[PDB]
Design a protein around this ligand. Structure first.
Ligand SMILES: CCCCCCCCO[C@@H]1O[C@H](CO)[C@@H](O)[C@H](O)[C@H]1O
Ligand SMILES: CCCCCCCCO[C@@H]1O[C@H](CO)[C@@H](O)[C@H](O)[C@H]1O
Ligand SMILES: CCCCCCCCO[C@@H]1O[C@H](CO)[C@@H](O)[C@H](O)[C@H]1O
Ligand SMILES: CCCCCCCCO[C@@H]1O[C@H](CO)[C@@H](O)[C@H](O)[C@H]1O
Ligand SMILES: CCCCCCCCO[C@@H]1O[C@H](CO)[C@@H](O)[C@H](O)[C@H]1O
Ligand SMILES: CC(C)C[C@H](N)C(=O)O
Ligand SMILES: [Cl-]
Ligand code: NA
Ligand code: NA
Length: 509
């Protein structure tokens, strides 16, 4: 089996797994929509009660499976719980990353396309004072790129440039993955992560220099870091916070599990897992939190900045920020640096959510790496046509896989590892070879608190939010639901073929 070559390479690869579009695009919007500082308390609590403990659990499961030649959940769940239902539950650990990859790589390609256009100066020219006259051109720029519907039909018409850039983006992902764990992902991470940190710090510094009649960057920081205990009683803020913690730490996506399956059986995962999680949180709350919101608040003030965040998931990052930058000397190049930052952030993450399908094809169907990467790329490329052409398909996938699915799967993997496999065997497995030990209090959090927390959250989700999503949506959501259910059936069939192959192999040995 492949292994990470160095400790630093492993840490930077896992940090790159985590530090993505989630830190720079998703976090600011989630925080802004939910009262800034009012979001942060639940967010910190969720990190401590869900993020940290689940990170350790996923590292442990991955390392445990890898020692036996398995990096994905169909096989790993079965190793933990020898029951056919384990294998079926395990399909989610392939299905989630695949469905998320389908839309995530497309959004990642937008950042490459924008980076290129900002670099070469093919960007809107706002008329030099009224905000709308400054934002509108950038709104139109994004809408023309992805082809937002201008009429009634729920159909997208991406530009030719966007489509070609998606092809290039797929090619770049493949070129890293096809080189494997140590020569591909690890090597790339040693270059991308420092570059990413440098760009982000530079952008924070530039943003902190912003001052207008409407405010300063510091007003943005105060908004985000001022506690509001009157929201702690709102289930919505908790659901938001926990969802962001899952997405941001790559938890419940089977991706941490697969990366950890390349860690040697003896190697520490306690300090390593904690460091990766901690690096992600610094990049999220310090870097991600200090770019978009402070820029927006400085130029528009808090109320408007909040209204912008609520407008869409992409307004703040693809429209508002570049518009703000355009009003400053060298602002187009600053826009380039921003999109280049997002691209590297996305790229180090998308390789992580494609690796689970690759590992499954290698481990369970015995494909060569080359064929496993190419088939994985073909499935993602093909499927992405749904997200590229059908309005709001992206939103549906992000909900079922990227939102509900990961919380469900996080709870599932915890129950399988800490309840069925056995809490004490699980604890031993986590701490084995640890440079540090997990604090004793975390045994009780993992066994009792975390699962209760998640169960309650999932119930509130199903009761107070999913009814609307099932009944108040346009009929075209069933196109996406049909397709991703078919993907689940296809993956279950592959797991069935893998057990048949194992049966035929064992009969020959
Ligand atoms: C069922 C269809 C399977 C894959 C068909 C993909 C067809 C891609 O179509 C392309 O879309 C681009 C972006 O809109 C346009 O720039 C090009 O005109 C067009 O060739
Ligand atoms: C990184 C290299 C990507 C090259 C993609 C080329 C896409 C060609 O796209 C064309 O570009 C023309 C000029 O911009 C436009 O007039 C047309 O709308 C468009 O068809
Ligand atoms: C679900 C994924 C398949 C949808 C993408 C199909 C691509 C359709 O392609 C379209 O064909 C039209 C007429 O031929 C042309 O007007 C456009 O150039 C082109 O975008
Ligand atoms: C997955 C749903 C989105 C698919 C993209 C629809 C692209 C619309 O393209 C349409 O294709 C029709 C059939 O070829 C043609 O009759 C029309 O010329 C054209 O408008
Ligand atoms: C609910 C999540 C709380 C996480 C914070 C744990 C802080 C670590 O707490 C420490 O743990 C050590 C090892 O058990 C003990 O030696 C110390 O008594 C204690 O200070
Ligand atoms: C799906 C995950 C790989 C996403 C990544 N953790 C991010 O924050 O963007
Ligand atoms: Cl374009
Ligand atoms: Na993240
Ligand atoms: Na990343």
């Amino acid at each position: 089996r492949e292994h990470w070559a160095t400790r630093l390479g492993l840490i930077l690869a896992m940090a790159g797994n985590a530090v993505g579009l989630g830190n720079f695009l998703r976090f600011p919007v989630q925080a802004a929509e939910n009262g800034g500082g009012a979001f942060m308390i639940p967010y910190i609590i969720a990190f401590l009660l869900v993020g940290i403990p689940l990170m350790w659990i996923e590292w442990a499961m991955g390392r445990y499976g890898g020692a036996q030649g398995h990096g994905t959940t169909p096989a790993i769940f079965y190793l933990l719980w020898r029951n056919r239902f384990a294998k079926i539950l395990g399909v989610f650990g392939l299905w989630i990353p695949l469905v998320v990859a389908i839309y995530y790589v497309y959004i990642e390609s937008w950042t490459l396309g924008f980076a290129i256009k900002f670099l070469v100066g093919l960007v809107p020219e706002p008329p030099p004072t009224d905000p709308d006259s400054i934002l509108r051109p950038f709104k139109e720029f994004l809408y023309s790129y992805i082809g937002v519907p201008k009429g009634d039909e729920p159909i997208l018409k991406p530009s030719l440039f966007a489509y070609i850039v998606f092809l290039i983006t797929m090619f770049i992902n493949v070129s890293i993955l096809i080189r494997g764990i140590s020569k591909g992902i690890e090597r790339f991470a040693k270059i991308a992560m420092p570059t990413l940190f440098i760009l982000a710090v530079f952008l924070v510094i530039r943003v902190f220099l912003l001052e207008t009649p409407n405010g300063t960057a510091a007003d943005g920081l105060n908004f985000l870091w001022t506690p509001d205990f009157e929201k702690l009683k709102d289930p919505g803020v908790w659901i938001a916070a926990v969802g962001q913690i899952f997405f941001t730490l790559s938890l419940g996506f089977g991706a941490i599990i697969t990366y950890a399956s390349y860690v040697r059986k003896d190697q520490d995962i306690v300090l390593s897992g904690l460091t990766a999680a901690t690096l992600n949180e610094k990049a999220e709350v310090i870097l991600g939190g200090s770019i978009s919101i402070p820029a927006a608040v400085a130029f528009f003030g808090v109320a408007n900045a909040v209204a912008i965040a609520k407008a869409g998931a992409f307004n703040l990052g693809f429209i508002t920020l570049p518009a703000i930058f355009s009003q400053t000397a060298g602002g187009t190049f600053l826009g380039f640096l921003w999109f280049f930052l997002l691209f590297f952030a996305g790229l180090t993450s998308s390789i992580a959510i494609m690796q689970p399908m690759i590992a499954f094809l290698e481990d369970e169907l015995k494909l060569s790496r080359k064929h496993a990467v190419l088939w994985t790329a073909a499935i993602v490329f093909f499927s992405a046509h749904l997200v590229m052409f059908l309005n709001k398909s992206l939103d549906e996938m992000d909900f079922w896989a990227g939102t509900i699915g990961v919380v469900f799967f996080g709870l599932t993997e915890l129950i399988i590892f800490f309840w069925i496999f056995g809490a004490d065997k699980a604890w031993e497995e986590i701490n084995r070879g640890g440079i540090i030990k997990v604090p004793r209090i975390y045994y009780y959090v993992m066994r009792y608190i975390t699962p209760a927390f998640l169960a309650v959250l999932l119930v509130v989700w199903a009761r107070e939010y999913i009814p609307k999503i099932m009944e108040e949506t346009h009929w075209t959501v069933w196109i996406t639901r049909f397709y991703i259910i078919g993907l689940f059936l296809f993956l279950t069939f592959l797991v069935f073929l893998a057990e048949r192959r194992r049966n035929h192999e064992s009969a020959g040995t």
